[PDB]
Design an enzyme around this catalytic site. Structure first.
Site, PDB file in Angstrom:
ATOM      1  N   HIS A 135      30.626 -30.863  22.634  1.00 41.09           N
ATOM      2  CA  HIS A 135      31.058 -29.470  22.642  1.00 41.09           C
ATOM      3  C   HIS A 135      31.722 -29.146  21.313  1.00 41.09           C
ATOM      4  N   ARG A 149      -8.454 -23.331  15.538  1.00 46.43           N
ATOM      5  CA  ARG A 149      -9.073 -24.329  14.677  1.00 46.43           C
ATOM      6  C   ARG A 149     -10.091 -25.128  15.480  1.00 46.43           C
ATOM      7  N   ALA A 194      -6.199 -15.880  12.251  1.00 53.30           N
ATOM      8  CA  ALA A 194      -5.582 -17.091  12.784  1.00 53.30           C
ATOM      9  C   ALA A 194      -6.001 -17.207  14.252  1.00 53.30           C
ATOM     10  N   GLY A 197     -17.164 -38.699   3.114  1.00 55.29           N
ATOM     11  CA  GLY A 197     -17.753 -39.804   3.864  1.00 55.29           C
ATOM     12  C   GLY A 197     -18.696 -39.324   4.960  1.00 55.29           C
ATOM     13  N   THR A 220      -5.213 -35.661  -2.787  1.00 50.59           N
ATOM     14  CA  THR A 220      -3.936 -36.009  -2.180  1.00 50.59           C
ATOM     15  C   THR A 220      -4.130 -36.461  -0.742  1.00 50.59           C
ATOM     16  N   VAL A 263      -4.062 -31.824   6.316  1.00 57.76           N
ATOM     17  CA  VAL A 263      -3.743 -30.412   6.491  1.00 57.76           C
ATOM     18  C   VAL A 263      -2.242 -30.225   6.674  1.00 57.76           C
ATOM     19  N   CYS A 264      -1.608 -31.097   7.465  1.00 57.81           N
ATOM     20  CA  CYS A 264      -0.179 -30.955   7.731  1.00 57.81           C
ATOM     21  C   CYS A 264       0.631 -30.934   6.438  1.00 57.81           C
ATOM     22  N   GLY A 276      -1.643 -16.790  18.289  1.00 56.06           N
ATOM     23  CA  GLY A 276      -1.141 -18.146  18.362  1.00 56.06           C
ATOM     24  C   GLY A 276       0.011 -18.394  17.409  1.00 56.06           C
TER      25      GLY A 276
HETATM   26  C1  LIG Z   1      -0.662 -23.379   8.995  1.00 59.61           C
HETATM   27  C2  LIG Z   1      -0.560 -24.626   9.830  1.00 59.61           C
HETATM   28  C3  LIG Z   1       0.656 -24.954  10.416  1.00 59.61           C
HETATM   29  C4  LIG Z   1       0.785 -26.075  11.232  1.00 59.61           C
HETATM   30  N1  LIG Z   1       2.037 -26.378  11.738  1.00 59.61           N
HETATM   31  C5  LIG Z   1       2.163 -27.452  12.459  1.00 59.61           C
HETATM   32  C6  LIG Z   1       3.482 -27.839  12.873  1.00 59.61           C
HETATM   33  O1  LIG Z   1       4.515 -27.244  12.580  1.00 59.61           O
HETATM   34  N2  LIG Z   1       3.532 -29.021  13.582  1.00 59.61           N
HETATM   35  C7  LIG Z   1       2.447 -29.830  13.898  1.00 59.61           C
HETATM   36  O2  LIG Z   1       2.659 -30.876  14.507  1.00 59.61           O
HETATM   37  N3  LIG Z   1       1.185 -29.461  13.499  1.00 59.61           N
HETATM   38  C8  LIG Z   1       1.063 -28.338  12.809  1.00 59.61           C
HETATM   39  N4  LIG Z   1      -0.176 -28.017  12.314  1.00 59.61           N
HETATM   40  C9  LIG Z   1      -1.322 -28.840  12.718  1.00 59.61           C
HETATM   41  C10 LIG Z   1      -1.461 -30.098  11.868  1.00 59.61           C
HETATM   42  O3  LIG Z   1      -1.691 -29.761  10.501  1.00 59.61           O
HETATM   43  C11 LIG Z   1      -2.632 -30.949  12.358  1.00 59.61           C
HETATM   44  O4  LIG Z   1      -2.477 -31.172  13.755  1.00 59.61           O
HETATM   45  C12 LIG Z   1      -2.729 -32.304  11.659  1.00 59.61           C
HETATM   46  O5  LIG Z   1      -2.731 -32.132  10.241  1.00 59.61           O
HETATM   47  C13 LIG Z   1      -3.945 -33.082  12.105  1.00 59.61           C
HETATM   48  O6  LIG Z   1      -3.818 -34.411  11.570  1.00 59.61           O
HETATM   49  P1  LIG Z   1      -5.250 -35.156  11.406  1.00 59.61           P
HETATM   50  O7  LIG Z   1      -4.994 -36.406  10.656  1.00 59.61           O
HETATM   51  O8  LIG Z   1      -5.898 -35.268  12.791  1.00 59.61           O
HETATM   52  O9  LIG Z   1      -6.180 -34.187  10.551  1.00 59.61           O
HETATM   53  P2  LIG Z   1      -6.023 -33.518   9.112  1.00 59.61           P
HETATM   54  O10 LIG Z   1      -4.618 -33.236   8.749  1.00 59.61           O
HETATM   55  O11 LIG Z   1      -6.878 -32.275   9.219  1.00 59.61           O
HETATM   56  O12 LIG Z   1      -6.628 -34.567   8.066  1.00 59.61           O
HETATM   57  C14 LIG Z   1      -8.050 -34.791   8.115  1.00 59.61           C
HETATM   58  C15 LIG Z   1      -8.448 -35.115   6.702  1.00 59.61           C
HETATM   59  O13 LIG Z   1      -9.821 -35.557   6.667  1.00 59.61           O
HETATM   60  C16 LIG Z   1     -10.403 -35.093   5.469  1.00 59.61           C
HETATM   61  N5  LIG Z   1     -11.844 -35.049   5.663  1.00 59.61           N
HETATM   62  C17 LIG Z   1     -12.534 -34.243   6.530  1.00 59.61           C
HETATM   63  N6  LIG Z   1     -13.826 -34.470   6.559  1.00 59.61           N
HETATM   64  C18 LIG Z   1     -13.994 -35.505   5.649  1.00 59.61           C
HETATM   65  C19 LIG Z   1     -15.127 -36.244   5.255  1.00 59.61           C
HETATM   66  N7  LIG Z   1     -16.323 -36.122   5.833  1.00 59.61           N
HETATM   67  N8  LIG Z   1     -14.959 -37.200   4.313  1.00 59.61           N
HETATM   68  C20 LIG Z   1     -13.731 -37.413   3.827  1.00 59.61           C
HETATM   69  N9  LIG Z   1     -12.585 -36.799   4.143  1.00 59.61           N
HETATM   70  C21 LIG Z   1     -12.785 -35.856   5.073  1.00 59.61           C
HETATM   71  C22 LIG Z   1      -9.761 -33.733   5.203  1.00 59.61           C
HETATM   72  O14 LIG Z   1      -9.820 -33.471   3.806  1.00 59.61           O
HETATM   73  C23 LIG Z   1      -8.323 -33.945   5.713  1.00 59.61           C
HETATM   74  O15 LIG Z   1      -7.399 -34.309   4.693  1.00 59.61           O
HETATM   75  C24 LIG Z   1      -0.340 -26.876  11.484  1.00 59.61           C
HETATM   76  C25 LIG Z   1      -1.558 -26.554  10.889  1.00 59.61           C
HETATM   77  C26 LIG Z   1      -1.679 -25.446  10.056  1.00 59.61           C
HETATM   78  C27 LIG Z   1      -3.001 -25.145   9.388  1.00 59.61           C
HETATM   79  C1  LIG Z   2      41.483 -27.264  15.114  1.00 61.46           C
HETATM   80  C2  LIG Z   2      40.906 -28.013  16.284  1.00 61.46           C
HETATM   81  C3  LIG Z   2      39.545 -28.292  16.308  1.00 61.46           C
HETATM   82  C4  LIG Z   2      38.977 -29.019  17.350  1.00 61.46           C
HETATM   83  N1  LIG Z   2      37.606 -29.213  17.344  1.00 61.46           N
HETATM   84  C5  LIG Z   2      37.073 -29.850  18.343  1.00 61.46           C
HETATM   85  C6  LIG Z   2      35.641 -29.937  18.404  1.00 61.46           C
HETATM   86  O1  LIG Z   2      34.870 -29.433  17.593  1.00 61.46           O
HETATM   87  N2  LIG Z   2      35.157 -30.577  19.526  1.00 61.46           N
HETATM   88  C7  LIG Z   2      35.923 -31.108  20.557  1.00 61.46           C
HETATM   89  O2  LIG Z   2      35.341 -31.617  21.512  1.00 61.46           O
HETATM   90  N3  LIG Z   2      37.294 -31.022  20.500  1.00 61.46           N
HETATM   91  C8  LIG Z   2      37.827 -30.415  19.452  1.00 61.46           C
HETATM   92  N4  LIG Z   2      39.186 -30.230  19.437  1.00 61.46           N
HETATM   93  C9  LIG Z   2      39.986 -30.861  20.494  1.00 61.46           C
HETATM   94  C10 LIG Z   2      40.025 -30.025  21.769  1.00 61.46           C
HETATM   95  O3  LIG Z   2      40.637 -28.759  21.525  1.00 61.46           O
HETATM   96  C11 LIG Z   2      40.823 -30.744  22.856  1.00 61.46           C
HETATM   97  O4  LIG Z   2      40.301 -32.059  23.006  1.00 61.46           O
HETATM   98  C12 LIG Z   2      40.763 -30.043  24.213  1.00 61.46           C
HETATM   99  O5  LIG Z   2      41.134 -28.670  24.077  1.00 61.46           O
HETATM  100  C13 LIG Z   2      41.631 -30.731  25.241  1.00 61.46           C
HETATM  101  O6  LIG Z   2      41.328 -30.138  26.516  1.00 61.46           O
HETATM  102  P1  LIG Z   2      42.548 -30.285  27.576  1.00 61.46           P
HETATM  103  O7  LIG Z   2      42.192 -29.456  28.749  1.00 61.46           O
HETATM  104  O8  LIG Z   2      42.814 -31.778  27.803  1.00 61.46           O
HETATM  105  O9  LIG Z   2      43.848 -29.699  26.868  1.00 61.46           O
HETATM  106  P2  LIG Z   2      44.187 -28.285  26.213  1.00 61.46           P
HETATM  107  O10 LIG Z   2      43.009 -27.618  25.622  1.00 61.46           O
HETATM  108  O11 LIG Z   2      45.257 -28.627  25.200  1.00 61.46           O
HETATM  109  O12 LIG Z   2      44.760 -27.373  27.398  1.00 61.46           O
HETATM  110  C14 LIG Z   2      46.040 -27.741  27.943  1.00 61.46           C
HETATM  111  C15 LIG Z   2      46.669 -26.449  28.383  1.00 61.46           C
HETATM  112  O13 LIG Z   2      47.873 -26.716  29.131  1.00 61.46           O
HETATM  113  C16 LIG Z   2      48.807 -25.701  28.841  1.00 61.46           C
HETATM  114  N5  LIG Z   2      50.135 -26.223  29.128  1.00 61.46           N
HETATM  115  C17 LIG Z   2      50.772 -27.251  28.485  1.00 61.46           C
HETATM  116  N6  LIG Z   2      51.934 -27.569  29.004  1.00 61.46           N
HETATM  117  C18 LIG Z   2      52.065 -26.689  30.070  1.00 61.46           C
HETATM  118  C19 LIG Z   2      53.057 -26.544  31.060  1.00 61.46           C
HETATM  119  N7  LIG Z   2      54.081 -27.385  31.205  1.00 61.46           N
HETATM  120  N8  LIG Z   2      52.896 -25.558  31.972  1.00 61.46           N
HETATM  121  C20 LIG Z   2      51.799 -24.796  31.906  1.00 61.46           C
HETATM  122  N9  LIG Z   2      50.784 -24.858  31.036  1.00 61.46           N
HETATM  123  C21 LIG Z   2      50.975 -25.839  30.145  1.00 61.46           C
HETATM  124  C22 LIG Z   2      48.576 -25.337  27.376  1.00 61.46           C
HETATM  125  O14 LIG Z   2      49.015 -24.001  27.166  1.00 61.46           O
HETATM  126  C23 LIG Z   2      47.049 -25.496  27.238  1.00 61.46           C
HETATM  127  O15 LIG Z   2      46.328 -24.279  27.401  1.00 61.46           O
HETATM  128  C24 LIG Z   2      39.797 -29.498  18.384  1.00 61.46           C
HETATM  129  C25 LIG Z   2      41.160 -29.210  18.366  1.00 61.46           C
HETATM  130  C26 LIG Z   2      41.722 -28.464  17.336  1.00 61.46           C
HETATM  131  C27 LIG Z   2      43.196 -28.128  17.365  1.00 61.46           C
END
Ligand SMILES: Cc1cc2nc3c(=O)[nH]c(=O)nc-3n(C[C@H](O)[C@H](O)[C@H](O)COP(=O)(O)OP(=O)(O)OC[C@H]3O[C@@H](n4cnc5c(N)ncnc54)[C@H](O)[C@@H]3O)c2cc1C
Ligand SMILES: Cc1cc2nc3c(=O)[nH]c(=O)nc-3n(C[C@H](O)[C@H](O)[C@H](O)COP(=O)(O)OP(=O)(O)OC[C@H]3O[C@@H](n4cnc5c(N)ncnc54)[C@H](O)[C@@H]3O)c2cc1C
Lengths: 478, 478
Positions: free
Chosen positions: A454, A282, A279, A115, A38, A42-43, A192
């Site tokens: 937000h 490497r 671990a 190789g 395949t 390693v990745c 690590g």
């Molecule tokens: C458990 C684990 C978790 C990891 N998690 C992450 C992660 O979350 N994020 C991340 O970015 N990296 C992670 N890594 C690291 C990542 O796997 C390596 O950095 C990456 O695979 C290296 O890519 P590469 O092509 O340099 O080498 P490799 O992936 O090692 O590929 C080299 C290849 O060459 C082949 N080969 C070797 N010698 C020969 C030869 N002489 N002839 C022919 N074929 C040969 C081998 O079979 C192999 O397939 C993790 C590694 C492990 C082991």
């Molecule tokens: C169900 C729901 C989900 C939403 N989800 C999102 C989301 O995920 N992300 C997002 O960015 N926006 C979302 N919104 C929109 C967001 O709530 C509004 O855009 C935001 O609250 C407006 O901010 P504001 O300060 O302009 O007004 P408001 O939050 O409406 O505040 C105005 C305030 O003025 C007060 N007020 C009004 N008239 C008077 C008065 N004459 N005297 C004194 N006080 C008064 C009110 O009591 C109120 O507290 C959602 C809204 C609802 C209803």
């Protein structure tokens, strides 16, 4: 003598297959030499994809426990490990199948063999057979492949510790992903990210955890304040978190593997475990491909150093991915592969390594990129930091993750954002905005005036920038 | 005559309290006039925060059903509506409490009363009493408040339909959030986001849904391709999705509310419902504050038009939030409030409305910002689009949301990104990167070369940009 290509890619991982597909899109005749059946490396086969698949399912199990206080009551789940293992393998096999089809569509030849360089323009491929990743054997047949350009992408391997004997209960990351059983007591050797992710999965499935690390903390490289939040939320999973402690003895016995630790706050008696996960990092595979026969220089540690075009010292041979240096991350490998492929097509392309994000897909996630407080102190770079606590986020409070935070780091002299860190759910999906902001040279005003939706966790990035400008009204005056 | 302030803010919603806190941070003496006891307005008390809280819990319930095929088996949950309602109210009361404490810390006076303009520099406040939001009555006491600057932030209200009678089974968004019971059959009148979110919650809790919309589709303003993906995944919740149909009769009866529809594909017989949710938009409150007594011009529809400094026609009176125009969104209100407050402090500040994201927190989420295909066709703007399908994302496949997608829109002449849309989980947390990219004038090369982490949903933004450049290797050649 047996086949000739514009580009031969050694290894089919994220680097290799991305390089090969990109070269084919540029109209070059390409081959991948990959010892296993395949693609995706390693990745895909034993790394990112199967681990995050298990982590995702485990995180829902954890969320369900917290739902009862909200009037949504479920019992503990019935766990079928066989069906969980097949779900994870099914994700990988869907992806490996797609990669094969994409190779055939792009007319990229895939050769299953080990190789080895013959000379600066030839590979000798010892053909291999076997369908399962990490389980292939040489047939004895050999094939010589000639190339104009070679892209080395042979990745890395599990670091071994010499003092640890062989025993089926002593596993590595691949053994962990095989999901043979849920051990009662699981020891993770090494603090690590990879081992901590596996620990998270097994912990949720029922395992008690211990972890040992010679160094001073877990997740080396992450800023301590992000790790402290991760650790506080995960303390309940562990019976012993042992840093600054040496592992001196691993002794398998009938009723468990017995491990002895030397540490200021580590127990003195040997501890029994049902399973031990090594671990401890490497190692790159540069010494294992006969590179010197091609003239390619390889460091003592096994890295193949490249310039910003991904070129080795030999101008027509490139190298990418884990085998050229840290960080060993799949998204680095992909981008480097694109750069190498375009240079193979005669388009001058350069790879910028300043902004490479790292993510722990633990619970909570830990995502960071660029300058850290750690590196800034090590280099002497003067910085300013702005921190938005998720205790101030209605979204996080509603969702039950109000312990997270978003932190931005700026250069003190220029004001540009140079780094960022997030701890809490979806950090991995949000850190990309920070990556882009660093790439674009944004300052705090650029990010803060950008209108984020937000209520979201992502708006914490904009509000942290508002913190930097002193104008956040969801926090006390600053 | 009773009190004098640098700045009086009329209404304490996201706009009003953000304006007031920002003005106080600039050292101005500020008061908020808010007819109800709690701050945070509609968004905090009966809007964003409680709705997303219910939506989040509902989405876990839905995820749990899909876990069994992966070997994690749970029964249906036992649902305690009383505890679910108290959980949501508990999130709001934690936040309203914090807002009060922040007002007192910033030395911003909070007056509970209905404010009406007396003249260009005075409010007459009919004091109100009552602790529950939307439930306060005048005491009869009156207070006259003088100001240098007034910031109008009096928000909006539920749009009423004249032909619909009063009946406890006919509710609005506040009635829905009260969570009295789970109706067996729920009719949503109006296809907009707010009603569809409430429908999602009640559907998961057990309600069958119908929806009716006079216009041509649901979620007006969203590009049809995002809504089509949302609809396909949600079709199972609805017995009738009726667009282009008129609601001609709402007749409450003993055993249900009977509603009659005229539509090309709507039933002809009257349909019985246990509950009817009227979610046909919201109207601004500009006509309800005696603004003409201050000299402030108000449109026939009730909007108070402002310039980019948020100034009414009267130079010392500002207006922000829902009451000045569409979109009626909380994050718009917040930013506009900052702009008005800084101008009250003598700092020339301008509000840019080009990049305001909208998000449906439905399942899947629908997040978009900037230019759409709809608006580009309406204006004639030549654009190019790049679409990354989540069927190509290992992350989405592992997570079971591989039907989503990420779409970017660029100006054809300049190449700059001018819009973006995402359908699928966490779109709301990811769209911020698109907002920032538009704000910064990025092109496809800027976004594509930015290294996003693997495996994530967020990297779909970078890969969609790679699609735009023709160099995505996780898709077939383009
Ligand atoms: C458990 C684990 C978790 C990891 N998690 C992450 C992660 O979350 N994020 C991340 O970015 N990296 C992670 N890594 C690291 C990542 O796997 C390596 O950095 C990456 O695979 C290296 O890519 P590469 O092509 O340099 O080498 P490799 O992936 O090692 O590929 C080299 C290849 O060459 C082949 N080969 C070797 N010698 C020969 C030869 N002489 N002839 C022919 N074929 C040969 C081998 O079979 C192999 O397939 C993790 C590694 C492990 C082991
Ligand atoms: C169900 C729901 C989900 C939403 N989800 C999102 C989301 O995920 N992300 C997002 O960015 N926006 C979302 N919104 C929109 C967001 O709530 C509004 O855009 C935001 O609250 C407006 O901010 P504001 O300060 O302009 O007004 P408001 O939050 O409406 O505040 C105005 C305030 O003025 C007060 N007020 C009004 N008239 C008077 C008065 N004459 N005297 C004194 N006080 C008064 C009110 O009591 C109120 O507290 C959602 C809204 C609802 C209803």
């Amino acid at each position: 003598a047996d086949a000739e290509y514009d580009v031969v890619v050694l290894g089919g991982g994220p680097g290799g297959y991305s390089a090969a597909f990109a070269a084919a899109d540029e109209g070059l005749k390409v081959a991948i030499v990959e010892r296993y059946k395949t693609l995706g490396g390693v990745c895909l086969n034993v790394g990112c994809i199967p681990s995050k698949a298990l982590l995702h399912n485990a995180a829902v199990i954890d969320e369900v426990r917290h739902l009862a206080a909200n009037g949504i009551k479920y019992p503990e789940p019935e766990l079928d490990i066989d069906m969980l293992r097949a779900y994870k393998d099914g994700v990988v096999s869907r992806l490996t199948g797609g990669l094969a089809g994409m190779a055939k569509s792009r007319k990229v030849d895939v050769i299953q063999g080990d190789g080895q360089f013959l000379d600066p323009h030839h590979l000798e491929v010892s053909l291999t057979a076997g369908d399962a990743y990490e389980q292939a054997a040489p047939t004895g047949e050999k094939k010589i492949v000639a190339f104009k350009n070679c892209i080395i992408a042979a990745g890395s391997r599990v670091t071994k510790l010499p003092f640890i004997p062989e025993d089926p209960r002593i596993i590595d990351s691949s053994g962990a992903l095989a999901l043979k059983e849920v051990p009662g007591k699981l020891l993770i050797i090494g603090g690590g990210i990879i081992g901590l992710e596996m620990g998270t999965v097994y912990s949720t499935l029922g395992s008690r955890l211990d972890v040992v690390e010679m160094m001073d903390g877990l997740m080396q490289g992450a800023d301590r304040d992000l790790v402290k939040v991760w650790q506080k939320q995960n303390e309940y999973r562990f019976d012993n978190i042992m840093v600054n402690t040496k592992t001196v003895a691993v002794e398998p016995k009938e009723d468990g593997v017995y491990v002895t630790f030397e540490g200021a706050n580590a127990p003195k008696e040997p501890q029994r475990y049902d399973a031990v996960l090594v671990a401890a990092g490497r190692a790159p595979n540069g010494k294992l491909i006969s590179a010197e026969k091609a003239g390619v220089a390889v460091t003592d540690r096994g890295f193949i150093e490249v310039d910003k075009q991904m070129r080795t010292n030999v101008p027509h041979i490139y190298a990418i991915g884990d085998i050229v240096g840290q960080p060993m991350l799949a998204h680095k490998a992909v981008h480097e592969g694109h750069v190498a492929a375009e240079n193979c097509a005669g388009h001058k392309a350069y790879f910028d390594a300043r902004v490479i994000p790292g993510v722990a897909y633990t619970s909570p996630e830990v995502a960071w990129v660029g300058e850290t407080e750690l590196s800034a102190k090590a280099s002497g770079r003067k910085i300013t930091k702005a921190n938005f606590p998720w205790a101030a986020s209605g979204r996080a409070i509603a969702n039950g993750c109000d312990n997270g935070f978003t932190k931005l780091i700026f250069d003190a002299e220029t004001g540009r954002i140079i780094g960022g860190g997030i701890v809490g759910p979806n950090g991995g999906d949000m850190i990309g905005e920070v990556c882009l902001a660093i790439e674009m040279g944004c300052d705090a005003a650029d990010i803060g005036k950008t209108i984020h939706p937000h209520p979201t966790l992502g708006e914490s990035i904009g509000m942290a920038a508002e913190v930097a400008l002193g104008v956040c009204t969801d926090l006390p005056p600053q």
